[PDB]
Write an enzyme that holds these catalytic residues in place. Structure first.
Site, PDB file in Angstrom:
ATOM      1  CB  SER A  73      -5.360 -19.734   0.103  1.00 25.18           C
ATOM      2  OG  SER A  73      -4.533 -19.821  -0.984  1.00 25.18           O
ATOM      3  CE  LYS A 106      -6.945 -20.477  -3.989  1.00 25.43           C
ATOM      4  NZ  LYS A 106      -5.949 -19.626  -3.337  1.00 25.43           N
ATOM      5  CE1 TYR A 138      -6.371 -24.167  -2.603  1.00 24.18           C
ATOM      6  CE2 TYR A 138      -4.031 -24.108  -2.236  1.00 24.18           C
ATOM      7  CZ  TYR A 138      -5.279 -23.569  -2.049  1.00 24.18           C
ATOM      8  OH  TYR A 138      -5.400 -22.542  -1.190  1.00 24.18           O
ATOM      9  CD  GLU A 177      -9.106 -27.747   2.882  1.00 22.36           C
ATOM     10  OE1 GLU A 177      -8.820 -28.110   4.029  1.00 22.36           O
ATOM     11  OE2 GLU A 177      -8.230 -27.320   2.116  1.00 22.36           O
ATOM     12  CE  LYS A 207      -8.410 -22.578   0.899  1.00 29.32           C
ATOM     13  NZ  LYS A 207      -7.021 -22.968   1.262  1.00 29.32           N
ATOM     14  CB  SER A 253       0.394 -18.635   4.030  1.00 23.85           C
ATOM     15  OG  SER A 253       0.144 -19.614   5.047  1.00 23.85           O
TER      16      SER A 253
END
Length: 357
Positions: A62, A65, A148, A270, A310, A313
């Site tokens: 992830s 992203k 999410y 984040e 962030k 996995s």
């Protein structure tokens, strides 16, 4: 010197995880005071007895992203899209469908109000993906609830690609990766680099790699090296040192868009008020935050001093990236087996704390 001291910190805080979780290989990078430090452990391939090294390519999960967000911000600052646009402006078959009431910022930041963590099992082909989004109907009020979601940020990446007239893999491999000075980062690992692509390992130490899936690339499909990810952190710490379009894009990804408790949702990243407690950073990966919808609150005042992180996995790999502008430090961890997110967060917190001026 700082080399030794950092290696010592990493040996004290990250190395013990290798034994605790039976991790075959790990790369940890730290950037501090404008210098990069690379620390490698273990094997990238157990069967081949190949050691993890500076050329080893890991699955970011992830953390992909972040690149999707950077790509969208780049598109937006070039005037290719507006974040107030809806997906049917670009993906015409969705024009005047209900998902075309959700804007690009809401897809990017998971607030469509009816998009789960994954596509259903049955959605696999391009057509089945198009169909999923045609048949989508709202549930929660658009913009109100954070859930999410791979399909949400995947749909964002797909429209970003459309807006640039390139498939998404080329958006990253031809535009964004080189713009950030990354040399060995991939959506599809080049033929001539397969010898460098780590295997990931499951809990039986069977070697595994990420399988294809619907809108995989924008959601979880990037692979990279330790030096590339430390470049990416360098870019986040120093956007001013990059060309205008990528600089603007990096700065745009740091802008908090709404708040959930003590976390602010930026693009991909984040964001937290800094200094942040460990518990605040742990709470960001709570089951409640990650797996369930949560009501968002509009930002009244963003924190004047921030930090960002962030986790990511795939089934065989773990990633964690963190930076703090004001301290001018950052860290990346890459492993070829999953370890609990809380261990990644705690280990990094200790190392960063030890090196703060």
């Amino acid at each position: 010197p700082k080399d030794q001291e950092i290696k010592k910190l990493v040996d004290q805080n990250f190395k013990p995880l290798l034994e605790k979780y039976d991790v075959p290989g790990m790369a940890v990078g730290v950037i501090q005071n404008n210098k990069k430090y690379e620390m490698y452990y273990g094997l990238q391939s157990v069967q081949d007895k190949k050691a993890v090294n500076s050329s080893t390519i890991f699955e970011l999960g992830s953390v992909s992203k972040l690149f999707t967000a950077t790509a969208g911000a780049y598109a937006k600052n070039k005037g290719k899209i507006s974040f107030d646009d809806t997906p049917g402006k670009y993906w015409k078959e969705l024009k005047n469908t209900p998902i075309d009431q959700v804007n690009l910022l809401q897809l990017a930041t998971y607030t469509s109000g009816n998009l789960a963590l994954q596509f259903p099992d049955e959605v696999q082909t391009d057509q089945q993906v198009l169909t999923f989004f045609k048949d989508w109907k709202p549930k929660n009020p658009i913009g109100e609830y954070r859930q999410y979601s791979n399909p949400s940020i995947g749909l964002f990446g797909k429209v970003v690609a459309l807006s640039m007239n390139k498939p998404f893999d080329q958006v990253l491999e031809k535009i964004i990766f080189p713009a950030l000075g990354l040399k060995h980062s991939y959506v599809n690992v080049a033929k001539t680099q397969m010898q460098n692509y780590a295997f990931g390992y499951n809990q039986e130490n069977q070697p595994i790699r990420v399988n294809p899936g619907p809108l995989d690339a924008p959601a979880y499909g990037v692979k990279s090296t330790l030096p590339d990810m430390l470049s990416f952190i360098h870019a986040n710490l120093n956007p001013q040192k990059y060309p205008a379009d990528i600089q603007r894009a990096i700065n745009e990804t740091h802008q908090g868009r709404y708040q959930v408790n003590t976390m602010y949702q930026a693009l991909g990243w984040e964001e937290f008020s800094y200094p942040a407690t460990l518990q605040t950073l742990l709470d960001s990966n709570s089951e409640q935050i990650v797996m369930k919808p949560n009501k968002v609150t509009a930002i009244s005042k963003e924190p004047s001093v921030k930090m960002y992180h962030k986790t990511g996995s795939t089934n065989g790999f773990g990633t964690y990236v963190v930076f703090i502008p004001k301290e001018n430090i950052g860290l990346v961890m890459l492993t070829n087996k999953r370890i609990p997110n809380e261990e990644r967060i705690k280990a990094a917190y200790a190392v960063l704390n030890a090196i703060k001026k």
